[PDB]
Amino acid sequence: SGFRKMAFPSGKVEGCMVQVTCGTTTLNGLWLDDVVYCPRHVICNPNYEDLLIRKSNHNFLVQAGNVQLRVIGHSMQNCVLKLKVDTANPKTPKYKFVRIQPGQTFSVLACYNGSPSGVYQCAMRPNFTIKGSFLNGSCGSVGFNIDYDCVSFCYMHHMELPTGVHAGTDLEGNFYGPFVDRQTAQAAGTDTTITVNVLAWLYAAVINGDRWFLNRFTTTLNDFNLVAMKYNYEPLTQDHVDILGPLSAQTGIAVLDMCASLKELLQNGMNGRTILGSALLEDEFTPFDVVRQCSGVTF
Amino acid sequence: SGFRKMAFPSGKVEGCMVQVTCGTTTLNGLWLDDVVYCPRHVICTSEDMLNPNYEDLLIRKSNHNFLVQAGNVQLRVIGHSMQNCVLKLKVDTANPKTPKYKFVRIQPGQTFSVLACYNGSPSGVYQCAMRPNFTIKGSFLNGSCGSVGFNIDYDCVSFCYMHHMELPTGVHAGTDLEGNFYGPFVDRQTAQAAGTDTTITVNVLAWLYAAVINGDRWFLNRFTTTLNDFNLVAMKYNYEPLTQDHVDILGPLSAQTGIAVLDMCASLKELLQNGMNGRTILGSALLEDEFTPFDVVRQC
Ligand SMILES: CNc1cncc(NC(=O)[C@@H]2CCOc3ccc(Cl)cc32)c1C
Numbered sequence: 001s002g003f004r005k006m007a008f009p010s011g012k013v014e015g016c017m018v019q020v021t022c023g024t025t026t027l028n029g030l031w032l033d034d035v036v037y038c039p040r041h042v043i044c045n046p047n048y049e050d051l052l053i054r055k056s057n058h059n060f061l062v063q064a065g066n067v068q069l070r071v072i073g074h075s076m077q078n079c080v081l082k083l084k085v086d087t088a089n090p091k092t093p094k095y096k097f098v099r100i101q102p103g104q105t106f107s108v109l110a111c112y113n114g115s116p117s118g119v120y121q122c123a124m125r126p127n128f129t130i131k132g133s134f135l136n137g138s139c140g141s142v143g144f145n146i147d148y149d150c151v152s153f154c155y156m157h158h159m160e161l162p163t164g165v166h167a168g169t170d171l172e173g174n175f176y177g178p179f180v181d182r183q184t185a186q187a188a189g190t191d192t193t194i195t196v197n198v199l200a201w202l203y204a205a206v207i208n209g210d211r212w213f214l215n216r217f218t219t220t221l222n223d224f225n226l227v228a229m230k231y232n233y234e235p236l237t238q239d240h241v242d243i244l245g246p247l248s249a250q251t252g253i254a255v256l257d258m259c260a261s262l263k264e265l266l267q268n269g270m271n272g273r274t275i276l277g278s279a280l281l282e283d284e285f286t287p288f289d290v291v292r293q294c295s296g297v298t299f
Numbered sequence: 300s301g302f303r304k305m306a307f308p309s310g311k312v313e314g315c316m317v318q319v320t321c322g323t324t325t326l327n328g329l330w331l332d333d334v335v336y337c338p339r340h341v342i343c344t345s346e347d348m349l350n351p352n353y354e355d356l357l358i359r360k361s362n363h364n365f366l367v368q369a370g371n372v373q374l375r376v377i378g379h380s381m382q383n384c385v386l387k388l389k390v391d392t393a394n395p396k397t398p399k400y401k402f403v404r405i406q407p408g409q410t411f412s413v414l415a416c417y418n419g420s421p422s423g424v425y426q427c428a429m430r431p432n433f434t435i436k437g438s439f440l441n442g443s444c445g446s447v448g449f450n451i452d453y454d455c456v457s458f459c460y461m462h463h464m465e466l467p468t469g470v471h472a473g474t475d476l477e478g479n480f481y482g483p484f485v486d487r488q489t490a491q492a493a494g495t496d497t498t499i500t501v502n503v504l505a506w507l508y509a510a511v512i513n514g515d516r517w518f519l520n521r522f523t524t525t526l527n528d529f530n531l532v533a534m535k536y537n538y539e540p541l542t543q544d545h546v547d548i549l550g551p552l553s554a555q556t557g558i559a560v561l562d563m564c565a566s567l568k569e570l571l572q573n574g575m576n577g578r579t580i581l582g583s584a585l586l587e588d589e590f591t592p593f594d595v596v597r598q599c
């Protein structure tokens with residue numbers, strides 16, 4: 001029993017965090033094999049090719065714990081700087097670079113000066129921002145998921161938007177969202193609620209013994225989407241309904257039956273009650289996160 | 300900017316998790332130097348749990364009755380001893396991944412990270428607090444016994460909790476790393492229940508100061524209160540009494556934001572009276588009590 005916002009164990013990622021310094025700027029880097037990956041703004045209307053051509057290998061100071069690594073090459077891939085180092089990281093885990101979709105969750109290992117300070121769980125919002133917790137020096141912190149023994153790196157932190165939310169790239173340097181790595185007027189778009197995740201969290205509440213919100217009613221997918229669109233909820237597709245299949249079979253509540261509970265919750269509120277200790281409908285647990293936490297998959 | 304429920308990086312603790320097996324029972328152990336620490340109920344059957352005599356069950360065991368597995372390597376048990384409700388298994392290999400560590404006993408209201416494990420394999424990390432009723436609101440399945448709670452301050456891991464049981468309400472009970480249970484619980488399957496839980500007042504105040512630091516002031520008011528009047532109101536909402544120690548502890552946050560502790564207490568009194576009226580504080584529609592004053596200073 002119990003339901004917590006749970007992150008993946010961060011140890012495999014901790015052994016990859018390094019400190020990257022260029023001039024007056026210090027931020028974090030990810031050391032995998034003989035390459036250190038970091039935001040290209042560490043060299044900073046910027047002309048990154050022009051700023052980079054003026055740099056030499058010895059301009060980049062890379063620190064791994066109390067050991068200085070020597071940079072032997074440098075190249076840019078989109079908004080990520082790749083620093084070739086002489087030493088391969090002996091703690092390099094089995095890994096992949098993956099680009100995630102909005103609604104998907106991941107763990108963030110927040111770092112300062114190449115030293116991990118905390119781990120938290122978050123989701124890629126539909127507006128491509130993340131609601132993170134970052135201070136100055138956090139740039140280069142990474143997001144990941146762990147599947148079996150493989151670490152899938154999906155995010156690298158680059159900036160904070162005026163509303164306090166965060167923007168970053170995948171590990172190939174492509175931003176999530178219409179953001180650019182430049183000091184200019186940028187804003188997060190209007191956000192929406194991740195419907196499939198709220199339904200997954202409602203199934204988690206039923207598994208943990210909370211059934212007050214259930215009702216005898218059902219709905220059609222079209223009628224539910226007309227309701228969900230009124231409340232700034234992401235449309236629910238047939239793929240979402242299929243992905244919720246296992247949870248529906250385990251609890252005995254059809255996905256469209258759970259959609260009828262959600263419809264009533266949106267139209268009437270909770271009426272002083274809570275669901276899994278929350279007075280808001282939680283959307284940062286995917287169907288897989290619910291299954292994993294209510295089954296016990298280890299890494 | 301931003302405020303999240305944040306756990307400590309678990310890597311230093313991952314390198315200490317092992318699987319301990321005795322007979323039909325398998326749970327987790329913590330391997331530090333040449334000792335593996337685990338709940339003493341690993342020697343019990345489900346029948347033994349009603350009225351176990353641990354000294355009598357332990358005297359019948361030998362070293363080779365305890366199978367300890369660290370990854371794909373079996374460790375050899377060369378000694379065993381009981382200290383309160385923890386079994387200590389002396390092994391022939393010191394853990395090369397042993398971090399700098401301490402065993403600390405925490406007080407209610409204190410927070411810590413839990414590395415939830417199954418079969419000696421870590422599956423997740425979350426942040427939680429020692430409730431005033433000495434239980435924790437965790438997330439544990441069968442096989443999680445032996446999972447540990449910790450804080451990392453600087454390079455030192457301070458172990459403060461080892462999981463032993465789940466109470467009928469779905470909350471959890473455990474011991475410190477010296478085997479002393481938190482609260483009036485025993486490692487027996489007798490009728491046991493969590494006492495009435497209360498809200499950790501000093502933590503809600505700390506979280507209100509975190510909201511002010513992140514730019515949210517809607518809940519502030521022109522009022523102040525005496526400590527006694529605040530406690531008379533707090534008790535009516537099941538809030539823990541606020542002591543002069545708590546007021547002293549909140550001093551730095553009060554100095555940083557410019558809001559006196561008793562002025563912040565007056566906002567809390569008004570929030571308990573009126574609710575949030577459709578508003579949120581740090582993305583929450585409830586008053587959060589699982590961030591200490593120390594956690595707020597660390598993350599903000
Ligand atoms: C979710 N299940 C779970 C989670 N966490 C721990 C457990 N194990 C226990 O509670 C065991 C079995 C039931 O009886 C007792 C009584 C006392 C003690 Cl110290 C341990 C136990 C489970 C079964």
Ligand SMILES: [Cl-]
Nearest residue numbers: 404405406409
């Ligand atoms: Cl304490």
